[PDB]
Amino acid sequence: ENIEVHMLNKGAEGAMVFEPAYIKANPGDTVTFIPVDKGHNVESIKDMIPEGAEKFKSKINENYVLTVTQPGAYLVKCTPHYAMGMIALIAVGDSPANLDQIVSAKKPKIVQERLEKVIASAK
Amino acid sequence: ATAAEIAALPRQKVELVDPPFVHAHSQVAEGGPKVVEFTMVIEEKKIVIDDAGTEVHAMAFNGTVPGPLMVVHQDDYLELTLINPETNTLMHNIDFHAATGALGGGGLTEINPGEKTILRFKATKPGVFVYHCAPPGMVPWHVVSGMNGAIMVLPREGLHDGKGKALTYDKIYYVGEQDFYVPRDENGKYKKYEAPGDAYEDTVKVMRTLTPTHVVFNGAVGALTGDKAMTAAVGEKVLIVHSQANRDTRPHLIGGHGDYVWATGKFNTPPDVDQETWFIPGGAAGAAFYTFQQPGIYAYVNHNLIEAFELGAAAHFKVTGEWNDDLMTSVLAPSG
Amino acid sequence: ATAAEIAALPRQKVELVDPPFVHAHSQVAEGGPKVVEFTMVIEEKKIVIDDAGTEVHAMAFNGTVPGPLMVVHQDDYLELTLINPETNTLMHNIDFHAATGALGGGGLTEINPGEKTILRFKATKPGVFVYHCAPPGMVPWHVVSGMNGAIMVLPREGLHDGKGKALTYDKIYYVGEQDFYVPRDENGKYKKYEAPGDAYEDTVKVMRTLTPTHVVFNGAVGALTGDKAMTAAVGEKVLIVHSQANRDTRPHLIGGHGDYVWATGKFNTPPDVDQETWFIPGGAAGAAFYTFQQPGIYAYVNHNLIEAFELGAAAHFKVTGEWNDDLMTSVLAPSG
Amino acid sequence: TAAEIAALPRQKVELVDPPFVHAHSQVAEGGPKVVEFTMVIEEKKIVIDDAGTEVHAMAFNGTVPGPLMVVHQDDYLELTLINPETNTLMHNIDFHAATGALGGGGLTEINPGEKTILRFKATKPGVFVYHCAPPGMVPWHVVSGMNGAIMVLPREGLHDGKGKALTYDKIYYVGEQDFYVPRDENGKYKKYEAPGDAYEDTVKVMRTLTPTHVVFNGAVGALTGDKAMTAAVGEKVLIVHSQANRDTRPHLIGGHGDYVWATGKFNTPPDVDQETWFIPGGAAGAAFYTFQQPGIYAYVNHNLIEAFELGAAAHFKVTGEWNDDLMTSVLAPSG
Ligand SMILES: [Cu+2]
Ligand SMILES: [Cu+2]
Ligand SMILES: [Cu+2]
Ligand SMILES: [Cu+2]
Ligand SMILES: [Cu+2]
Ligand SMILES: [Cu+2]
Ligand SMILES: [Cu+2]
Ligand SMILES: [Gd]
Ligand SMILES: [Gd]
Ligand SMILES: [Gd]
Ligand SMILES: [Gd]
Ligand SMILES: [Gd]
Ligand SMILES: [Gd]
Ligand SMILES: [Gd]
Ligand SMILES: [Gd]
Ligand SMILES: [Gd]
């Protein structure tokens, strides 16, 4: 099935956000990213996607449909606003093997704080 | 100059102070070109702006709105080490209008919490200019939050009028004006939050109205009055730099005037003279020099009377000295 | 000058007229410095501002918004006896931007109903300036109510361009612009009150919106049109002084242009030239000099088209003379 | 004399669409000449926002802002305007650079199915804004996008304040336009069938003195992305900007106005070293700057809100070699 995500300049958690920021899906599902405001895109973060999944990067302002195949956790960012915290976590299948690794990886402090919130309060 | 030539120039570290005061500096350059070094940590916290306890999540360079005024001469290179502490939650960046290349330094200074960088640019044009953070996609928000100040690159030989005479000031103050946009609830009371991002959507709605709920100087209504009222004595010359990095203002010293005022904030451009009220366009800092001739309390504020008395754009300078009747005298005091 | 010297200078009483006209005066000063004497009684009354009958409790110096334009030369002292009749109900005060000391004379002219004073100040700088009442705590209200005008201190040698050539105007008109803020009821209709105090809270609310319901010249929409439209003829040089003591405007003569325009309203500051639309910042009065070359009806108004046609900032000057095809000619009139 | 005016050479010039400019020489070639230009007005609906917002535009030459006509001082501009029968509103043109007849508006009122020809002598040098202004509906026709700007350059080209000649390799004209689109009770922009159907609702928005969108070229993002201007290090470029009914404050992010005739008049000395200038509603200015660093630079109304939230921000892509002397990242962003 399909899960729709919006990219906004301002939302529930503050400025520059993906809503929802926690996406639960299964292999074969699609995630459709819709920039409701301009200036946003979606890009997989290096070493924060599962082992055999392909990297991806959409163009700014375009609607992008991601098909997810490999199970595991994926942290995606908005390229321009990553440093301002704009990320989302996609969890494919149950108990994603790489989730603790992604939570521990090096990333901006603001990113880390939002990630922690979404895993607690968004799961 | 080549990299080798720049590496052999003398470097001078400068300690910045908090507005409206400026750090120590000589009008006339002492020596040739030198790489001036200044460091400012950004602190996003909550500052009260009025007596009603209104609060704005300020993003402040050096912990003060507006950031501190850096002062170097033309030709000297300003090297600024910025640091965004892990305690913050948003990535910033600094774009100095007085620089050339990389969106004013914003394209090479994006640093997220826990990151610091160092950018050095040559000050090739003389004049006050406004610097301000502008992260791609959230520029207006960071500037309105109080993330902007101004630097003054003074001519190697100091300042001079339009004919070439030297104008030297005994005191210089920097008043950064800031127009905020605070969200209110249904009853009209300002709303307060707990984090900076929680007030982003509500703030944008107010910013679109192009109508600031408060326009003040130094980050708060009544900030430069009382214990902060500037000071000057009859016979003293004072240069008052003023900057607005998100709104046009019109400075006016009540009881005095801008003898010489570089409205455009560019020294090469001749300074208007005998000015009652000047005009500085959003995104620009100017400067006015005036020699006080009468003692007493004078208010200095954005003429928009509404913006200066109802919003909060009015400061006050206390001046000491002897009154001069020749200039003004009450022949008949108010009576029946 | 010492008191004995000032006391020995010739005094000249001048009868003021009502805008847009200006009292008789000589461009070039006749004789040395002289204490000019002017007296104005303030009258808070009700005046209509539009054709619908909207009424605003105006505070008017000399019974006219904007007050009358006083004219003296640089060096001469302006002595003004102000009188606040007992019939009025609020204390006023006058602050002349062209004076130095005591908040422009507002700190030494606070007079409550039934009191009058006399303040004398030396006109030390040449240029048009805006005066306006400003009682501590209620400044913006008194100015928006129409309590402000402008005085012109002309260089002892008359006015000259930016290179030294003499510019002599055949006639001069003073157009004071005033942005009001009238409260409206639920039906969107303007509200009327009995006394000036009953409209204070509702007005403040409108003033905070920084959006004037009516911006006009002479105190009312259409005040300088019809039989009141200014007049000029081809080959006539006319200087139009304009002031705004509470809002930035941008003058523009439709069909003409400001040959020489001291936008800042300071004579020492060289006058721009060939200007299509100038800019005078709230809290300041400027001056534009232009020699008419074509006959017909021209509208002079704040370019903000909305402010000039929808609010009421547009006057009209009728000009007599012969058309000049060389400058403009309809080769093909509107046809199929 | 009359014979002299009738003997001057007439030359027709094809106009391009903003921000480009037609073909012309800085220094005048030959003596005074009657320049002839023809523009048809087209009233149509154009989108001006990524949400499909639409504004019944009134456009001279089919483009907001109209095209920039360029002649020299002394030359006479003769413009044949044409209002097609398909249109439904009478227009007219008033050029600030002309003298007499409300700037030509009193002798150019043409209703659908009518065209005229008005000639005026360009007696003053400097950029100036032209705009339609039918008696009683001026503000509506201008806000609808019926305004542009013409540049009358000194016969000897442009020079600084000391007489030095300033010759630009390229020139672009960015007309800014503040619209006022009516929204329903839910905050959604409203669309209409014809131009008059939105006259009362638009006036209400215009009274607020708060434009719902302020942009350049007639649409948010019209001069950004693949349509971003262009310039190379060492290139001198003059950027004329006009605002027929709203004050703006231009600013080239990453650069500066080396010489800027803020008032848009050449006779008036050009300020210099300007970070942000100021052009008052009803006036067009011009800034000349030599690019020294390559990369993408944004140029927009400083009112940040008006430049990022409304749509007043374009971008110039510049090619060349970076110059560390001017600016260098000693320590790139890192822990
Ligand atoms: Cu984004
Ligand atoms: Cu920031
Ligand atoms: Cu800026
Ligand atoms: Cu009063
Ligand atoms: Cu004042
Ligand atoms: Cu039209
Ligand atoms: Cu106009
Ligand atoms: Gd403080
Ligand atoms: Gd002291
Ligand atoms: Gd006394
Ligand atoms: Gd009257
Ligand atoms: Gd007559
Ligand atoms: Gd005829
Ligand atoms: Gd296009
Ligand atoms: Gd090219
Ligand atoms: Gd490097």
Side-chain angles (χ1 to χ4, degrees):
Chain A
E1 250 325 272
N2 179 44
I3 292 109
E4 181 178 313
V5 182
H6 291 186
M7 278 114 96
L8 308 144
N9 294 351
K10 203 5 197 133
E13 298 292 338
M16 279 342 174
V17 295
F18 283 100
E19 282 189 346
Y22 177 68
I23 295 122
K24 177 68 228 301
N26 294 289
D29 285 346
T30 51
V31 185
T32 301
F33 291 94
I34 297 177
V36 172
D37 293 321
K38 333 117 280 286
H40 311 277
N41 86 325
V42 313
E43 191 189 342
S44 70
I45 293 170
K46 2 78 108 100
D47 275 296
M48 294 191 208
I49 52 178
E51 304 171 71
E54 281 181 293
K55 132 132 231 215
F56 43 87
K57 189 179 176 196
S58 78
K59 343 171 171 113
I60 288 180
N61 292 334
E62 90 154 298
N63 262 18
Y64 182 74
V65 180
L66 173 76
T67 299
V68 290
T69 300
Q70 313 292 324
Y74 292 59
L75 195 69
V76 301
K77 58 174 177 165
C78 164
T79 309
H81 301 113
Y82 178 54
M84 318 190 71
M86 195 156 175
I87 47 121
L89 177 76
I90 301 172
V92 183
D94 35 24
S95 47
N98 62 333
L99 180 52
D100 291 327
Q101 177 248 154
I102 280 164
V103 169
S104 71
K106 186 195 192 206
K107 47 183 91 79
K109 211 163 159 215
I110 170 43
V111 174
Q112 185 66 22
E113 283 175 28
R114 279 217 255 228
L115 172 58
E116 268 166 19
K117 179 133 164 26
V118 300
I119 284 161
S121 37
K123 79 130 188 302
Chain B
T2 70
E5 280 167 346
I6 297 167
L9 296 173
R11 256 83 152 171
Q12 181 186 12
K13 286 191 280 308
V14 173
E15 269 67 57
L16 293 156
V17 289
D18 293 345
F21 299 105
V22 179
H23 68 274
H25 68 277
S26 179
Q27 282 165 49
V28 173
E30 302 181 335
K34 316 200 209 295
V35 164
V36 240
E37 299 166 300
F38 294 62
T39 289
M40 296 185 319
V41 177
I42 303 144
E43 307 268 18
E44 307 161 353
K45 55 207 239 218
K46 280 172 148 205
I47 60 163
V48 179
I49 61 176
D50 60 31
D51 54 24
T54 303
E55 302 169 347
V56 155
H57 277 265
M59 305 172 185
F61 278 114
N62 223 56
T64 63
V65 175
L69 179 99
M70 298 175 241
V71 178
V72 318
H73 287 80
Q74 178 183 185
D75 317 324
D76 294 338
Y77 304 73
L78 191 160
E79 190 161 277
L80 158 89
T81 291
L82 184 73
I83 297 158
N84 192 10
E86 34 162 76
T87 49
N88 286 340
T89 76
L90 311 162
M91 164 288 268
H92 298 289
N93 78 347
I94 188 149
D95 154 6
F96 284 90
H97 271 252
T100 294
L103 302 174
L108 312 157
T109 52
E110 293 183 5
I111 45 171
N112 328 25
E115 289 193 315
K116 73 166 194 195
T117 176
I118 301 173
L119 163 95
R120 165 186 110 242
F121 73 86
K122 196 187 186 162
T124 61
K125 298 175 182 289
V128 293
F129 295 80
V130 150
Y131 66 78
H132 58 41
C133 157
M138 327 169 78
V139 168
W141 188 38
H142 288 239
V143 179
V144 289
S145 294
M147 197 149 185
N148 65 81
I151 79 161
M152 190 169 53
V153 180
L154 297 143
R156 282 192 121 49
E157 291 312 314
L159 312 156
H160 291 64
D161 57 22
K163 292 102 215 252
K165 198 157 176 270
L167 292 164
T168 301
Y169 52 81
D170 304 302
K171 298 189 64 183
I172 175 180
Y173 291 106
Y174 162 47
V175 174
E177 171 171 352
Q178 174 74 57
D179 49 315
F180 288 121
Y181 302 80
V182 188
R184 300 118 88 142
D185 54 32
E186 308 302 285
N187 298 127
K189 288 205 208 183
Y190 292 113
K191 298 173 58 185
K192 296 178 180 100
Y193 309 73
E194 278 339 285
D198 293 354
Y200 188 60
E201 240 228 283
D202 287 348
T203 306
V204 169
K205 183 164 178 188
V206 191
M207 290 158 61
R208 253 133 135 56
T209 70
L210 300 188
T211 308
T213 61
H214 310 64
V215 178
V216 304
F217 309 135
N218 222 215
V221 184
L224 296 190
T225 74
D227 58 322
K228 301 220 165 198
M230 264 128 302
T231 53
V234 171
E236 275 196 333
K237 34 209 174 160
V238 179
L239 183 86
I240 304 163
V241 173
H242 189 125
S243 91
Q244 232 285 2
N246 201 85
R247 176 121 132 93
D248 309 323
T249 172
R250 47 232 73 129
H252 171 98
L253 179 67
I254 306 200
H257 311 63
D259 284 340
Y260 306 89
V261 176
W262 297 271
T264 74
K266 309 313 166 262
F267 285 131
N268 274 335
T269 300
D272 297 329
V273 301
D274 300 339
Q275 304 282 293
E276 67 185 307
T277 296
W278 5 130
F279 186 75
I280 297 166
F289 165 122
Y290 171 74
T291 299
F292 280 95
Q293 298 192 276
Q294 301 262 52
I297 294 157
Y298 296 58
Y300 161 96
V301 334
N302 177 342
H303 215 245
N304 212 314
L305 286 199
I306 301 173
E307 318 175 340
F309 285 111
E310 285 285 350
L311 299 200
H316 309 137
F317 297 61
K318 298 176 186 156
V319 185
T320 64
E322 178 184 299
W323 180 268
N324 184 340
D325 281 290
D326 188 16
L327 289 177
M328 173 188 294
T329 209
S330 176
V331 176
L332 178 70
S335 36
Chain C
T2 72
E5 279 151 20
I6 297 171
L9 296 173
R11 250 113 264 216
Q12 176 186 16
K13 168 79 186 164
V14 167
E15 272 73 48
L16 292 152
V17 296
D18 298 334
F21 299 105
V22 179
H23 70 272
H25 64 272
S26 61
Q27 283 169 50
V28 178
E30 325 195 276
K34 310 190 299 253
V35 162
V36 210
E37 295 174 309
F38 298 84
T39 283
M40 296 188 316
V41 178
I42 299 140
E43 290 284 352
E44 306 160 359
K45 53 206 237 209
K46 317 155 125 199
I47 64 163
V48 168
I49 58 174
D50 55 32
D51 286 9
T54 299
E55 322 174 308
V56 158
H57 290 273
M59 305 176 189
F61 277 117
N62 219 51
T64 59
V65 177
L69 181 95
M70 296 173 251
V71 179
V72 307
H73 285 82
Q74 180 182 184
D75 320 314
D76 294 337
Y77 302 73
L78 193 159
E79 188 162 272
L80 159 87
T81 294
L82 187 70
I83 298 158
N84 192 15
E86 50 191 0
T87 48
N88 286 343
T89 76
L90 310 162
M91 164 287 269
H92 295 287
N93 83 347
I94 185 150
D95 155 6
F96 287 91
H97 273 234
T100 293
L103 306 170
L108 308 159
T109 52
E110 290 186 5
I111 44 172
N112 312 85
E115 290 193 311
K116 61 161 193 185
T117 175
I118 298 175
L119 166 94
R120 169 186 102 251
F121 73 84
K122 192 192 205 159
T124 58
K125 303 173 175 289
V128 289
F129 296 77
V130 141
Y131 66 78
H132 59 50
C133 157
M138 305 271 184
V139 167
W141 188 39
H142 284 237
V143 191
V144 298
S145 293
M147 197 149 183
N148 65 79
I151 79 163
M152 180 172 67
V153 178
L154 290 140
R156 281 187 119 47
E157 296 282 51
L159 305 165
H160 290 64
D161 64 10
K163 290 299 179 158
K165 195 213 247 97
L167 291 170
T168 301
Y169 47 82
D170 298 314
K171 67 175 345 168
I172 171 189
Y173 286 113
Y174 160 49
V175 172
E177 172 170 347
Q178 174 74 59
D179 49 316
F180 288 115
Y181 301 79
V182 186
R184 295 124 93 138
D185 53 29
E186 278 299 294
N187 303 344
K189 303 294 175 282
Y190 297 119
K191 298 174 49 181
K192 304 162 67 205
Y193 304 82
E194 301 176 15
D198 302 337
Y200 177 79
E201 294 300 347
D202 286 352
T203 302
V204 171
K205 186 163 176 180
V206 183
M207 289 159 61
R208 256 137 130 54
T209 73
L210 301 184
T211 307
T213 58
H214 306 55
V215 181
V216 307
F217 307 137
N218 227 197
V221 192
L224 302 182
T225 71
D227 54 6
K228 304 300 170 62
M230 276 111 312
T231 54
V234 170
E236 195 156 26
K237 345 190 235 174
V238 177
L239 179 88
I240 303 162
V241 177
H242 190 128
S243 61
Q244 233 302 20
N246 197 77
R247 177 96 131 73
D248 310 323
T249 173
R250 52 233 64 135
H252 156 99
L253 179 67
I254 307 195
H257 318 78
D259 284 340
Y260 306 87
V261 184
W262 297 270
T264 74
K266 308 317 167 256
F267 284 133
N268 277 334
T269 301
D272 297 328
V273 299
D274 301 338
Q275 303 281 293
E276 66 185 308
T277 298
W278 6 130
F279 186 75
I280 297 167
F289 184 123
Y290 171 74
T291 297
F292 280 91
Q293 314 263 332
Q294 299 262 54
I297 304 298
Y298 298 55
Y300 162 96
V301 332
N302 178 342
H303 214 243
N304 214 296
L305 290 186
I306 301 171
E307 319 167 345
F309 286 110
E310 287 286 348
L311 298 206
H316 300 140
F317 286 41
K318 317 153 143 183
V319 182
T320 61
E322 313 164 353
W323 181 261
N324 184 338
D325 284 294
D326 194 12
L327 288 176
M328 177 186 289
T329 203
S330 173
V331 179
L332 177 68
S335 44
Chain D
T1 74
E4 280 166 356
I5 297 164
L8 298 173
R10 246 108 269 201
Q11 168 190 210
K12 307 172 182 296
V13 166
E14 295 172 330
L15 291 150
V16 295
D17 303 337
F20 298 101
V21 179
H22 62 270
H24 65 278
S25 62
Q26 278 161 55
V27 178
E29 292 168 330
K33 314 168 153 63
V34 153
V35 209
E36 300 166 306
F37 298 84
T38 286
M39 304 195 296
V40 180
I41 299 151
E42 296 174 14
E43 299 164 0
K44 51 185 185 187
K45 288 184 284 174
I46 61 164
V47 174
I48 71 158
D49 86 332
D50 60 14
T53 288
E54 311 166 338
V55 156
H56 284 263
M58 303 181 192
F60 276 128
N61 222 51
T63 60
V64 176
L68 180 104
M69 288 168 263
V70 178
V71 307
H72 287 81
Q73 178 179 186
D74 322 326
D75 293 339
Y76 304 66
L77 195 157
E78 191 162 90
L79 157 89
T80 291
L81 184 74
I82 297 158
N83 193 13
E85 58 192 350
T86 47
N87 288 352
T88 83
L89 305 164
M90 165 284 273
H91 297 284
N92 80 347
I93 191 155
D94 152 6
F95 287 88
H96 274 235
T99 293
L102 302 174
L107 315 157
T108 49
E109 288 181 12
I110 50 173
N111 308 91
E114 289 190 306
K115 66 167 187 181
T116 176
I117 300 178
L118 160 96
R119 179 232 319 175
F120 73 84
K121 191 183 180 186
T123 60
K124 302 174 175 289
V127 290
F128 295 81
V129 146
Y130 66 79
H131 56 47
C132 157
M137 297 177 283
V138 167
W140 184 38
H141 283 243
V142 175
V143 289
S144 293
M146 199 151 182
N147 65 86
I150 79 161
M151 187 166 60
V152 183
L153 293 142
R155 237 188 224 331
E156 289 311 309
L158 316 150
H159 295 56
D160 62 12
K162 301 133 209 92
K164 303 294 170 248
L166 294 165
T167 304
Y168 49 82
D169 301 299
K170 71 180 340 176
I171 169 187
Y172 292 109
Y173 162 47
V174 172
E176 173 175 345
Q177 173 74 59
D178 49 316
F179 288 118
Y180 302 79
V181 188
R183 320 152 140 154
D184 53 32
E185 69 211 288
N186 306 322
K188 262 66 160 137
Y189 291 114
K190 300 173 47 182
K191 311 167 158 198
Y192 306 76
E193 287 161 344
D197 296 337
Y199 181 92
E200 192 176 289
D201 289 347
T202 302
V203 170
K204 184 165 181 193
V205 187
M206 291 154 60
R207 277 174 93 75
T208 70
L209 298 189
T210 304
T212 58
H213 309 63
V214 180
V215 308
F216 312 137
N217 234 190
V220 183
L223 299 179
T224 61
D226 293 335
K227 302 185 196 198
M229 259 139 299
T230 54
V233 171
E235 195 162 19
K236 345 184 226 178
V237 180
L238 183 85
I239 303 165
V240 177
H241 193 124
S242 76
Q243 233 292 355
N245 169 84
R246 171 95 134 93
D247 312 321
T248 167
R249 50 233 66 136
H251 167 91
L252 178 66
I253 304 196
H256 314 58
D258 283 339
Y259 307 88
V260 180
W261 297 270
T263 71
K265 310 313 164 262
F266 285 131
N267 276 340
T268 300
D271 297 329
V272 301
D273 299 338
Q274 300 286 295
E275 67 185 306
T276 296
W277 7 129
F278 184 76
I279 297 164
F288 184 122
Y289 170 74
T290 301
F291 278 94
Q292 309 274 140
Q293 299 263 55
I296 176 107
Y297 295 59
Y299 160 100
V300 332
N301 178 340
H302 214 245
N303 190 308
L304 287 196
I305 299 174
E306 310 163 354
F308 284 109
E309 284 288 349
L310 296 205
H315 314 132
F316 294 62
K317 296 186 239 153
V318 185
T319 67
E321 179 181 327
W322 180 268
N323 183 341
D324 282 292
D325 186 17
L326 287 176
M327 174 188 293
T328 215
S329 174
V330 175
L331 178 68
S334 44

mmCIF file of all heavy atoms in Angstrom, chain D residues 317-329:
data_model
loop_
_atom_site.group_PDB
_atom_site.id
_atom_site.type_symbol
_atom_site.label_atom_id
_atom_site.label_comp_id
_atom_site.label_asym_id
_atom_site.label_seq_id
_atom_site.Cartn_x
_atom_site.Cartn_y
_atom_site.Cartn_z
ATOM 1 N N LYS D 317 23.261 32.897 -11.937
ATOM 2 C CA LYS D 317 24.303 31.861 -11.935
ATOM 3 C C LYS D 317 25.497 32.489 -12.599
ATOM 4 O O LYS D 317 25.394 33.107 -13.640
ATOM 5 C CB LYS D 317 23.836 30.641 -12.732
ATOM 6 C CG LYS D 317 22.629 30.009 -12.037
ATOM 7 C CD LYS D 317 22.255 28.705 -12.747
ATOM 8 C CE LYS D 317 20.816 28.797 -13.258
ATOM 9 N NZ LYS D 317 20.654 27.912 -14.446
ATOM 10 N N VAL D 318 26.606 32.401 -11.984
ATOM 11 C CA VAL D 318 27.796 33.062 -12.540
ATOM 12 C C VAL D 318 28.902 32.056 -12.681
ATOM 13 O O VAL D 318 29.148 31.242 -11.814
ATOM 14 C CB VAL D 318 28.243 34.186 -11.605
ATOM 15 C CG1 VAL D 318 29.395 34.960 -12.248
ATOM 16 C CG2 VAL D 318 27.069 35.137 -11.355
ATOM 17 N N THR D 319 29.569 32.109 -13.772
ATOM 18 C CA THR D 319 30.689 31.146 -14.004
ATOM 19 C C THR D 319 32.033 31.873 -13.884
ATOM 20 O O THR D 319 32.115 33.074 -14.053
ATOM 21 C CB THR D 319 30.560 30.543 -15.405
ATOM 22 O OG1 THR D 319 30.771 31.559 -16.376
ATOM 23 C CG2 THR D 319 29.161 29.951 -15.581
ATOM 24 N N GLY D 320 33.091 31.156 -13.597
ATOM 25 C CA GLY D 320 34.422 31.817 -13.472
ATOM 26 C C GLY D 320 35.271 31.102 -12.416
ATOM 27 O O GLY D 320 34.973 29.999 -12.004
ATOM 28 N N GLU D 321 36.332 31.729 -11.982
ATOM 29 C CA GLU D 321 37.213 31.107 -10.961
ATOM 30 C C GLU D 321 37.015 31.815 -9.623
ATOM 31 O O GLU D 321 36.927 33.025 -9.548
ATOM 32 C CB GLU D 321 38.673 31.239 -11.398
ATOM 33 C CG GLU D 321 39.582 30.616 -10.337
ATOM 34 C CD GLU D 321 41.044 30.773 -10.760
ATOM 35 O OE1 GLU D 321 41.303 30.734 -11.953
ATOM 36 O OE2 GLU D 321 41.879 30.930 -9.886
ATOM 37 N N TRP D 322 36.942 31.061 -8.572
ATOM 38 C CA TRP D 322 36.750 31.642 -7.233
ATOM 39 C C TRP D 322 37.995 32.420 -6.853
ATOM 40 O O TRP D 322 39.089 32.147 -7.304
ATOM 41 C CB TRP D 322 36.513 30.523 -6.218
ATOM 42 C CG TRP D 322 36.325 31.116 -4.857
ATOM 43 C CD1 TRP D 322 37.312 31.314 -3.954
ATOM 44 C CD2 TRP D 322 35.097 31.590 -4.234
ATOM 45 N NE1 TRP D 322 36.768 31.880 -2.815
ATOM 46 C CE2 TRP D 322 35.405 32.070 -2.939
ATOM 47 C CE3 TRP D 322 33.758 31.651 -4.661
ATOM 48 C CZ2 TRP D 322 34.421 32.590 -2.098
ATOM 49 C CZ3 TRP D 322 32.765 32.174 -3.818
ATOM 50 C CH2 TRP D 322 33.096 32.643 -2.538
ATOM 51 N N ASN D 323 37.820 33.390 -6.030
ATOM 52 C CA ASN D 323 38.958 34.233 -5.584
ATOM 53 C C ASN D 323 39.039 34.135 -4.069
ATOM 54 O O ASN D 323 38.218 34.668 -3.352
ATOM 55 C CB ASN D 323 38.719 35.687 -5.997
ATOM 56 C CG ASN D 323 39.925 36.538 -5.595
ATOM 57 O OD1 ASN D 323 40.712 36.139 -4.758
ATOM 58 N ND2 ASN D 323 40.105 37.700 -6.158
ATOM 59 N N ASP D 324 40.003 33.425 -3.584
ATOM 60 C CA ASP D 324 40.132 33.241 -2.110
ATOM 61 C C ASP D 324 40.459 34.571 -1.449
ATOM 62 O O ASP D 324 40.013 34.862 -0.357
ATOM 63 C CB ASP D 324 41.250 32.237 -1.818
ATOM 64 C CG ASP D 324 40.741 30.818 -2.070
ATOM 65 O OD1 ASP D 324 39.884 30.375 -1.322
ATOM 66 O OD2 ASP D 324 41.216 30.196 -3.005
ATOM 67 N N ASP D 325 41.240 35.376 -2.096
ATOM 68 C CA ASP D 325 41.606 36.694 -1.499
ATOM 69 C C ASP D 325 40.340 37.386 -0.995
ATOM 70 O O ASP D 325 40.289 37.890 0.110
ATOM 71 C CB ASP D 325 42.277 37.568 -2.562
ATOM 72 C CG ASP D 325 42.778 38.861 -1.917
ATOM 73 O OD1 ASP D 325 42.886 38.892 -0.702
ATOM 74 O OD2 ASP D 325 43.043 39.801 -2.649
ATOM 75 N N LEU D 326 39.319 37.405 -1.800
ATOM 76 C CA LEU D 326 38.046 38.050 -1.391
ATOM 77 C C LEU D 326 37.365 37.232 -0.288
ATOM 78 O O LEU D 326 36.831 37.787 0.653
ATOM 79 C CB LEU D 326 37.114 38.144 -2.600
ATOM 80 C CG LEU D 326 37.617 39.231 -3.551
ATOM 81 C CD1 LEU D 326 36.743 39.258 -4.806
ATOM 82 C CD2 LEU D 326 37.547 40.590 -2.851
ATOM 83 N N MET D 327 37.356 35.920 -0.380
ATOM 84 C CA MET D 327 36.680 35.142 0.692
ATOM 85 C C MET D 327 37.139 33.692 0.659
ATOM 86 O O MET D 327 37.209 33.073 -0.385
ATOM 87 C CB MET D 327 35.166 35.199 0.481
ATOM 88 C CG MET D 327 34.476 34.272 1.485
ATOM 89 S SD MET D 327 32.714 34.158 1.086
ATOM 90 C CE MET D 327 32.284 35.875 1.462
ATOM 91 N N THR D 328 37.442 33.140 1.797
ATOM 92 C CA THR D 328 37.887 31.708 1.826
ATOM 93 C C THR D 328 37.453 31.028 3.138
ATOM 94 O O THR D 328 37.605 31.579 4.210
ATOM 95 C CB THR D 328 39.411 31.652 1.710
ATOM 96 O OG1 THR D 328 39.785 30.509 0.953
ATOM 97 C CG2 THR D 328 40.029 31.566 3.106
ATOM 98 N N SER D 329 36.931 29.821 3.060
ATOM 99 C CA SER D 329 36.514 29.104 4.297
ATOM 100 C C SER D 329 37.757 28.489 4.934
ATOM 101 O O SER D 329 38.243 27.460 4.507
ATOM 102 C CB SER D 329 35.517 28.000 3.941
ATOM 103 O OG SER D 329 35.227 27.237 5.104
#
